[PDB]
């Protein structure tokens, strides 16, 4: 098994209001993100004869 | 002369940056108080009551 690795999507900012300048809520929001995996793997062919 | 000036520390400023909300913070203190050796020395009078 071969597993890969994939890369989440895209967040966004926030447009904060004059009114909180001064307080905790200056610097918008928070973007989170995580990471995911993906796999491979393989069958078999096989084929036979006799003489 | 029957007063005195005890203190601990000076006037100090303290500046401090606070990221989270970009203010940049501003802290003077100081520790000072007002004594005097014996009970007189003082007398102050008032309009009447």
Redesign the interface.
């Known amino acids: 098994i071969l597993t890969m690795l994939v890369e989440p999507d895209a967040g966004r900012a926030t447009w904060v209001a004059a009114s909180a300048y001064?307080?905790?809520n200056?610097?918008g929001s928070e973007v989170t993100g995580a990471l995911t995996e993906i796999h491979f793997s393989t069958y078999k062919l096989a084929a036979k004869s006799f003489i | 002369d029957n007063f005195v000036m005890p203190r601990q520390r000076a006037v100090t400023v303290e500046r401090e940056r606070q990221a989270?909300?970009?203010?940049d913070a501003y802290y003077v203190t100081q520790r000072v108080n007002l004594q005097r050796y014996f009970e007189n020395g003082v007398v102050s009078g008032a309009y009447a009551a």
């Open positions: 001064g307080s905790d200056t610097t | 989270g909300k970009q203010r």
